[PDB]
Design a protein around this ligand. Structure first.
Ligand SMILES: CCCCCCCCCCCCCCCCCC(=O)OC[C@H](CO[C@@H]1O[C@H](CO[C@H]2O[C@H](CO)[C@H](O)[C@H](O)[C@H]2O)[C@H](O)[C@H](O)[C@H]1O)OC(=O)CCCCCCCCCCCCCCCCC
Ligand SMILES: CCC1=C(C)/C(=C/C2=NC(=C\c3[nH]c(/C=C4\NC(=O)[C@H](C)[C@H]4CC)c(C)c3CCC(=O)O)/C(CCC(=O)O)=C2C)NC1=O
Ligand SMILES: CCC1=C(C)/C(=C/C2=NC(=C\c3[nH]c(/C=C4\NC(=O)[C@H](C)[C@H]4CC)c(C)c3CCC(=O)O)/C(CCC(=O)O)=C2C)NC1=O
Ligand SMILES: CCC1=C(C)/C(=C/C2=NC(=C\c3[nH]c(/C=C4\NC(=O)[C@H](C)[C@H]4CC)c(C)c3CCC(=O)O)/C(CCC(=O)O)=C2C)NC1=O
Ligand SMILES: CCC1=C(C)/C(=C/C2=NC(=C\c3[nH]c(/C=C4\NC(=O)[C@H](C)[C@H]4CC)c(C)c3CCC(=O)O)/C(CCC(=O)O)=C2C)NC1=O
Ligand SMILES: CCC1=C(C)/C(=C/C2=NC(=C\c3[nH]c(/C=C4\NC(=O)[C@H](C)[C@H]4CC)c(C)c3CCC(=O)O)/C(CCC(=O)O)=C2C)NC1=O
Ligand SMILES: CCC1=C(C)/C(=C/C2=NC(=C\c3[nH]c(/C=C4\NC(=O)[C@H](C)[C@H]4CC)c(C)c3CCC(=O)O)/C(CCC(=O)O)=C2C)NC1=O
Ligand SMILES: CCC1=C(C)/C(=C/C2=NC(=C\c3[nH]c(/C=C4\NC(=O)[C@H](C)[C@H]4CC)c(C)c3CCC(=O)O)/C(CCC(=O)O)=C2C)NC1=O
Ligand SMILES: CCC1=C(C)/C(=C/C2=NC(=C\c3[nH]c(/C=C4\NC(=O)[C@H](C)[C@H]4CC)c(C)c3CCC(=O)O)/C(CCC(=O)O)=C2C)NC1=O
Lengths: 173, 48, 160, 92, 161, 160, 280, 54, 161, 161, 160
């Protein structure tokens, strides 16, 4: 992976030049929000086991089909508790790697460890991609409930969850 | 193409050699042949 | 501790500690006594805090206290405060050696199978630690309780 | 070939176990040790006996002895059953 | 692209020998089922749209590939399916007449599973659509004719897997 | 949108964007405040725009809901209104994108293949969208009804 | 966006075992025809056969009676059995079994003891419909995988789907309101057979596998910690790995019989060379 | 019984209904004949009752 | 990897319904043939080496694949055959007991015809070996049991084609 | 790894003689108790977790091995116990079915007391846990079945001593 | 036996025995009365089963007993029948063990190395066991001859 810093330094190494001030201004924008990026992360560790629970009920309250028999399409939704146990487990990962990626200030950790082969894996097990992405942003609204009076923490929290949404899409447009 | 299967196209050549046909219609007249369809459409994948 | 993690993590690569790691030891040792000053604050409030933990773990969960529950009876409740005492004692270790291993080599690794063979509901113990963290905020000011806050919720993350 | 080509620090293959074993070495130890897994309680795999006594070669005793202590093992006894001592030529 | 007669002639020719009793023995076996295959290919041509409408409604009509995000959401993507399922029901009809599945891998199977992985088409839902399409095809042509037409459906499902 | 195909137009021509293209991206983004208000009206009127949309559709096409019609019974009639909720949603996309490009590659490209392959009368679903158009333009002023109705009739044109 | 792709082969995850099933797989994994012991394995469960099957239909036919008699015990508020919804997939049909519950428009007691002590039964509409839309659905399902375990070989399919189940629904359910309902199905299902006959002991043993294991702590999640940096740690419910044939291992304790020391060594050949070249 | 009696005219087939018994419904396809609706869709069924009667 | 009972339970479970009369109707049909399949799998286990020795000597023993240049010339290559034919006679025995050919394409058929083309193994001679092996298998287990064991041989031959 | 039948066959084979009246006399004695052992192994499989929970709470639950400094203090160390006690209750079940304790020393006893001395595990508390575990096992399976299952517990305790 | 390898099967898989394994240990021990009767028939028929066994063996393979054959003379012919007495004994073990596990690790594992190293034609000794099989199955009913013959042909299979 690469944080915002190492990604910035590779940006200037490829061109083989020292760090100018436009390069350092990008680093300073991380160092300013870096102290704010932690209690976002620290709130997630304190709210982790909860925030998955509100995401699941908010998901199945709109997708009751996911708790039902699959139809003859052998599809992996949360039908059985074996299916339900593993299916809650995926929400663990989406909250986790989107928690590191809040601290790195860059989605480099996301795609190489979550996105690479994600459509591969779900197409094998026939897993829902639609509801799978919707639960990713149910977490985003749920996390943004805590930091809401101001609006500069909101763009920070949105960046990891928004990146998984745009990338797991089969592109309609 | 071999002389065996070119007998089926001899009606197309001399129609062209007497200046009675264009080039584009010569090309389409060859490609719509069964000599071509049996070679590059039939024994191949539908997208290849 | 934290230096042990650097010696170990540098030892499996067969190299001395790098520039960044020696920061991680140097910065940890410069914040030394403040953990030492903090643990003496918590040791003087162990009878403080576990009395407050038994406040809300049981008003939240009277199932365990009632006749039939695991904690029913005097001697069952007697060790009940002892488990709080060992956990609070473990957290003073974790607050000092600035990482999670004393909370992980003890207490966390294999805790569910310990409780499941005891009859203690493992979900109830998660609320017990969450109750214990709720109790530590009152006898501690705002400066130093967020220093000790990340050591508590690691235990909750470890127990799930 | 052998494990001492010129590799050390700052070299392309990663810094790793370097044994002083010659070309096709024919020396082997007889070691004895216990090695508790220290990882079964979050993996929940089946259990295997940890007290083993086996003949490890000289070509890879150092890596094995370096690793047995990596996971907290204790080495109770080792010997050089096969091979000579101070032997310039003939370890092959 | 060989039928049962082409495959019999090829194997008998590839050894340079004439059509002995064993080669003609299979050819007589193919001519006996010649009457069954045409009537099987007759009704399948008639109920081509009805069979595909029955398969998709029975296998993958209401699953969440049909809903947004699923692999079949947009109308271009839905329309590609029944276009795509038409080939499986059509080429399987050709294999049922020719009595040899050589045409399938020649014109359908090669580069197929490698193509669906490129587009991201779910191979799991595809085979169940063909399995459901195989189930309705046994309804029309009967039991043994369904056994014949069904013998090439799972050939597609096997190689496409 | 107007931004993406004004680009891919000038993209193919090996050139940048003319004033005719850049004075309209400019003119479109200043129009963006008014577009979100229009789409905001149709967003939480889908209960009436769809249900009254299927109101006139059945009064004008009782065959499709009568026994033998494609949308017959409690089941198909629910899906009978589901498609209208789809096409009403795509019109909200076209209003915000300033073009039928969202409506083009969703619900329009190859739509006749789907509905012919579903047994649905494609002319019947065209009648449904027209009934939604009169309900939609009745909810907005004249300046807006020349837009919201404007995207429906494009969907009417491509749907036959 | 991902700029590469490994492909997605069709994979059917394991769901359960059956007695007809795993013994076909055990000799399969050892690369051998099953022997006469295992051929004697596959035969007399097939010889169980119709006995297992008839237990399904007699249990399946009065499925409503099995479910309703639990509803009288632990659900206040009249009938409260309307929220049943047997077809759970929204299909038109292919065919349906026959149940045929209440006909005209708790009848006789004489032994009926459900709640062991002062247990609060869930009232009704205080409880609410949406939560009520599961409780009859799960009293349904406990009738189901039991009638899949009888028809299958083992109770294994019950064990996978009932291990952590009580924990997951523990917050929206009083757990003791399940143990009462699950011990009403065996008391109802034992009304069907002449006891001390062979079928009476079969289905009774399958009920106490699900109800006693229902009151049982959930398995702990298995963790896969990685050794070096570039790997990533995973985590799997222990439910997930105990479903299916469950591939075997081989160990070389010196002192085994020289066949099982031979089956383990030849097992080592197939692992490293992919084909037992000593056999080949 | 066939009852082929006489005057088997062709035109004017009329109306009414009878719904004769199935068979062979004793075969065994594993999949049903499908149907939308359920989960994701209780909203619109309840809501197409609204116009059902019109 | 599903048997007849697993496939019946899956289809009855995939619609979320119980085991109705039609699902149990096929299950009773499988239990009736349970006695036949074990005795069929019994004798095949006994005469495994004898059946393969009979098939190769009857189909491809003296053909010029056996001679130099043929696909089976060297002793490593000949020994790979009877190793290879053992799987077909073995996995077909598994399908005969499980009553469902899912194990074949799961563990035999997938990547098989794509593998023989890589090695250059003649698929034509392979199927005739399995056909001859199917012919001797009907000798041992009888007629109907041979019909059962034979029903999975041509399943291998069909997909391997 | 020999059962009662394997041990009887071995001793009768090791002298090269047939199974005389004395060898079959013990075999008949084993078949008579075959019905008792399965039901004994039946209930032990059901109450495996309950038996181990009863033994540790009755023998070493509150002793100071359980407290800090004792041999069982940390949760990893406590969890190793019930994992460790599971083998004793499990392998004893195998000896009860096989009717011969050869499997115990083959797979449990060898290197066991030499391993606990390495770890520093108290052999004294271990045997009393197995003795208490033997006491509860006689509760479930009955008297004579407890005599059978109990006969292999003290075999473990004897060799582990 | 079936008891010992049904255990070591479930032993390796870290699990107990399934109903499929325990309903066959159960089914085998009730079969034990009938097994001892079958082995009791072959026990005191070894005089005829062996001597008539070597009867057909020499009539079918006169080379092995002719001058130059491996079993030539008064000496080797006695040992020529000794091996048949061995293999007839192991079949009595396999019948009582319900499996060829006794026959596996005695007289079958590495048998080709012995007989190749003794100069004996391994195909010849296979012919001897087949001749014993016809004598053995002629001494029992059809239900038994499907077992006693069943263990011989396994020995025939492994002996070539
Ligand atoms: C003059 C009499 C004054 C009595 C004062 C009193 O309250 O004395 C208290 C004692 C008992 O005290 C109780 O003693 C209990 C002892 O613990 C017990 O209960 C514990 C519960 O935690 C344990 O689980 C365990 O079971 C056991 O140790 C608990 O501590 C109770 O909280 C505590 O109230 O009463 C007694 O012994 C004597 C009770 C009778 C006294 C009056 C007799 C005359 C009345 C009728 C006249 C006609
Ligand atoms: C780090 C990034 C990452 C992810 C996300 C991941 C997912 C992942 N999800 C899986 C299964 C699964 N996932 C689900 C999930 C769902 N079912 C539904 O219906 C819902 C849409 C959804 C829950 C939101 C189910 C049911 C299975 C099991 C499928 C089956 O066996 O039937 C499996 C196979 C089991 C295993 O874990 O070994 C993997 C690997 N792996 C990764 O490395
Ligand atoms: C250092 C880490 C560590 C812990 C935590 C530990 C716990 C532990 N808890 C125990 C029992 C117990 N623990 C409880 C606990 C509780 N009841 C409730 O309602 C509560 C939520 C909870 C206490 C806060 C009960 C009721 C028992 C007795 C169960 C019985 O034996 O019947 C026992 C058996 C012996 C004993 O009490 O000492 C151990 C070993 N051991 C360790 O080494
Ligand atoms: C981390 C703790 C640790 C140590 C210390 C260790 C030592 C160790 N030293 C070795 C050899 C050796 N060590 C020496 C050392 C010396 N010769 C002299 O004259 C000097 C007195 C001395 C240098 C100070 C030599 C020459 C060998 C090679 C011996 C041979 O080839 O026979 C070997 C044999 C294998 C190999 O080198 O690849 C081991 C395993 N292993 C460990 O895990
Ligand atoms: C976003 C663009 C888009 C559209 C439009 C779309 C349509 C669509 N309409 C469907 C069904 C259907 N659609 C109708 C529709 C109608 N019946 C009538 O009488 C009327 C004329 C008409 C509605 C106004 C009916 C009855 C069905 C069910 C047909 C069946 O069950 O066979 C289905 C199959 C079930 C499903 O997955 O919903 C799809 C995919 N999908 C899309 O992605
Ligand atoms: C076939 C074996 C099997 C069962 C039974 C099973 C149950 C199961 N019950 C669930 C929930 C639930 N189950 C119930 C109720 C009850 N459950 C009972 O066993 C009682 C009869 C009743 C309480 C008295 C309720 C109220 C919920 C919703 C809980 C929630 O909102 O999270 C869920 C989560 C999805 C859902 O909302 O339905 C599963 C997966 N899964 C299985 O694989
Ligand atoms: C269980 C499913 C399964 C099958 C079937 C399988 C086949 C398979 N057959 C192979 C080779 C082979 N197969 C043959 C077979 C034949 N030659 C002929 O002329 C005949 C037509 C045919 C015998 C019927 C030969 C000669 C080779 C060796 C090829 C070589 O050395 O190049 C190889 C290469 C590696 C090896 O044998 O060790 C594999 C992997 N693998 C599997 O996992
Ligand atoms: C199948 C035959 C067999 C046995 C029996 C066996 C035992 C065995 N017990 C172990 C540890 C242990 N065993 C105990 C047991 C106890 N502590 C007490 O106070 C009690 C007296 C006792 C429980 C009855 C403990 C606490 C450990 C952990 C020791 C440590 O972490 O240092 C270990 C070290 C590795 C590990 O557990 O992963 C092995 C290998 N291995 C085998 O293959
Ligand atoms: C229980 C399993 C088992 C077997 C089978 C066995 C065989 C065995 N056969 C032997 C010899 C022999 N075996 C034969 C056998 C034969 N000659 C023929 O023509 C026939 C084909 C064939 C017998 C049917 C002969 C001739 C010798 C003596 C060879 C010599 O003297 O060089 C010997 C050496 C002398 C002795 O110690 O008896 C052994 C050990 N040992 C065992 O433990």
């Amino acid at each position: 992976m690469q944080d915002i810093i190492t990604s910035v330094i590779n940006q200037y190494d490829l061109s083989g030049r020292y760090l100018d001030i436009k390069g350092i201004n990008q680093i300073n924008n991380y160092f300013d929000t870096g102290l704010k990026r932690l209690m976002i992360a620290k709130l997630i560790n304190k709210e982790a086991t909860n925030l998955i629970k509100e995401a699941s009920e908010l998901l199945f309250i709109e997708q009751p089909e996911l708790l039902r028999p699959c139809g003859n399409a052998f599809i992996g939704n949360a039908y059985t508790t074996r299916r339900y146990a593993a299916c809650i487990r995926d929400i663990e990962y989406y909250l986790r790697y989107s928690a590191y990626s809040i601290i790195a200030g860059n989605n480099s950790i996301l795609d190489e460890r979550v996105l690479d082969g994600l459509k591969e894996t779900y197409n094998s097990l026939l897993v829902p991609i639609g509801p799978t992405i919707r639960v990713i942003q149910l977490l985003k609204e749920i996390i943004q409930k805590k930091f809401s009076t101001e609006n500069i923490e909101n763009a920070i929290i949105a960046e990891p969850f928004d990146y998984l949404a745009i990338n797991l899409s089969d592109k309609n447009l | 193409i071999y002389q065996n299967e070119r007998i089926g196209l001899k009606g197309i050549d001399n129609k062209f050699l007497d200046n009675n046909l264009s080039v584009k219609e010569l090309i389409r007249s060859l490609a719509i042949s069964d000599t071509f369809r049996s070679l590059y459409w039939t024994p191949l994948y539908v997208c290849k | 501790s934290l230096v042990t993690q650097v010696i170990l993590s540098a030892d499996d690569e067969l190299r001395y500690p790098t520039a960044g790691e020696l920061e991680t030891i140097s910065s940890y040792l410069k914040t030394g006594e403040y953990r030492i000053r903090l643990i003496s604050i918590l040791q003087g409030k162990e009878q403080e805090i576990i009395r407050l933990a038994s406040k809300k773990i049981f008003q939240l969960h009277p199932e365990y206290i009632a006749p039939g529950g695991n904690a029913s009876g005097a001697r069952q409740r007697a060790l009940c405060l002892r488990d709080y005492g060992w956990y609070l004692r473990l957290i003073t270790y974790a607050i000092l050696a600035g990482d999670k291993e004393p909370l992980e080599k003890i207490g966390i690794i294999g805790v569910r199978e310990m409780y499941n063979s005891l009859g203690v509901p493992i979900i109830g113990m998660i609320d017990a630690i969450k109750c214990l963290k709720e109790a530590t905020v009152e006898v501690i000011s705002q400066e130093e309780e967020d220093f000790v806050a990340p050591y508590y919720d690691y235990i909750i993350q470890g127990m799930s | 070939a052998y494990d001492m080509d010129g590799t050390g620090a700052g070299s392309l293959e990663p810094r790793g176990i370097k044994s002083s074993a010659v070309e096709k070495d024919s020396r082997c130890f007889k070691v004895t040790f216990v090695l508790p897994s220290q990882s079964r309680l979050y993996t929940f795999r089946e259990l295997q006996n940890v007290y083993t006594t086996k003949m490890v070669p000289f070509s890879s005793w150092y890596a094995e002895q370096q690793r047995i202590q990596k996971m907290g093992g204790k080495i109770l006894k080792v010997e050089l059953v096969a091979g000579g001592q101070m032997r310039s030529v003939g370890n092959q | 692209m060989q039928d049962a007669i082409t495959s019999v002639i090829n194997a008998a020719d590839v050894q340079g020998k004439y059509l002995d009793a064993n080669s003609v023995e299979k050819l007589r076996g193919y001519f006996q089922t010649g009457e069954l295959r045409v009537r099987a290919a007759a009704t399948i041509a008639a109920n081509a749209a009805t069979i595909i409408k029955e398969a998709v409604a029975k296998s993958l009509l209401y699953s969440d590939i049909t809903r947004p995000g699923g692999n079949m959401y947009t109308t271009r993507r839905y329309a590609a399916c029944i276009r795509d399922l038409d080939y499986y029901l059509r080429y399987a009809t050709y294999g049922m007449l020719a009595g040899d599945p050589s045409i399938l891998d020649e014109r359908v199977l090669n580069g197929l599973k490698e193509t669906y992985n490129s587009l991201g088409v779910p191979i799991g839902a595809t085979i169940q659509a063909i399995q459901a399409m195989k189930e309705v095809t046994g309804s029309l042509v009967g039991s043994d004719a369904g056994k014949e037409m069904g013998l090439y459906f799972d050939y597609i499902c096997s190689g496409l897997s | 949108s107007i931004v993406t195909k004004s680009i891919v137009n000038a993209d193919a021509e090996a050139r940048y964007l003319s004033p005719g293209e850049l004075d309209r991206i400019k003119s479109f983004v200043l129009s963006g405040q008014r577009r979100l208000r229009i789409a905001q009206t149709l967003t939480e009127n889908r209960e009436r725009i769809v249900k009254q949309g299927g109101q006139q559709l059945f009064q004008r096409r009782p065959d499709v809901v009568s026994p033998g019609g494609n949308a017959y019974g409690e089941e198909m009639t629910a899906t009978c209104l589901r498609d209208l909720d789809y096409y009403l949603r795509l019109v909200t996309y076209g209003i915000i994108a300033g073009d039928v490009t969202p409506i083009e590659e969703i619900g329009l490209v190859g739509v006749k293949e789907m509905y012919s392959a579903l047994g649905t009368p494609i002319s019947g679903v065209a009648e449904g969208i027209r009934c939604m158009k009169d309900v939609a333009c009745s909810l907005l002023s004249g300046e807006d009804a020349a837009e919201v109705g404007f995207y429906f009739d494009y969907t009417l044109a491509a749907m036959q | 966006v991902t700029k590469a792709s490994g492909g997605s082969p069709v994979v059917k995850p394991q769901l359960y075992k059956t007695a007809s099933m795993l013994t076909i797989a055990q000799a399969e994994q050892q690369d051998r025809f099953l022997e006469l012991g295992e051929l004697n394995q596959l035969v007399s469960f097939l010889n169980t056969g119709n006995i297992r099957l008839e237990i399904a239909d007699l249990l399946t036919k009065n499925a409503n009676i099995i479910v309703a008699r639990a509803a009288d015990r632990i659900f206040v508020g009249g009938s409260a059995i309307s929220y049943l919804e047997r077809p759970q997939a929204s299909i038109i049909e292919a065919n349906s079994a026959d149940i045929a519950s209440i006909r005209q428009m708790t009848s006789v007691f004489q032994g009926n003891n459900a709640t062991p002590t002062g247990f609060k039964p869930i009232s009704v509409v205080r409880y609410g419909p949406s939560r009520m839309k599961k409780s009859l659905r799960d009293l349904d399902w406990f009738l189901r995988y039991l009638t899949y375990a009888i028809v299958a070989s083992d109770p294994n399919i019950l064990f996978v789907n009932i291990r952590g189940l009580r924990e997951i629904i523990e917050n929206a359910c009083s757990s003791a309101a399940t143990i009462v309902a699950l011990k009403e199905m065996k008391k109802t299902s034992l009304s069907l057979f002449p006891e001390n006959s062979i079928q009476k002991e079969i289905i009774e043993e399958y009920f106490n596998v699900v109800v006693d294991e229902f009151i049982n702590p959930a398995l702990t999640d298995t963790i896969r910690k990685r050794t070096s940096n570039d790997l990533q740690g995973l985590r799997l419910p222990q439910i997930y790995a105990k479903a299916g044939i469950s591939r075997q291992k081989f160990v070389m304790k010196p002192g085994l019989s020289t066949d099982e020391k031979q089956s383990v060594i030849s097992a080592c050949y197939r692992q490293v060379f992919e084909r037992d070249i000593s056999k080949a | 019984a066939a009852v082929g009696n006489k005057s088997n005219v062709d035109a004017p087939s009329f109306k009414g209904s009878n719904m004769e018994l199935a068979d062979s419904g004793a075969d065994y396809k594993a999949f049903p004949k499908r149907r939308m609706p359920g989960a994701n869709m209780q909203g619109f069924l309840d809501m197409a009752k609204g116009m059902k009667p019109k």
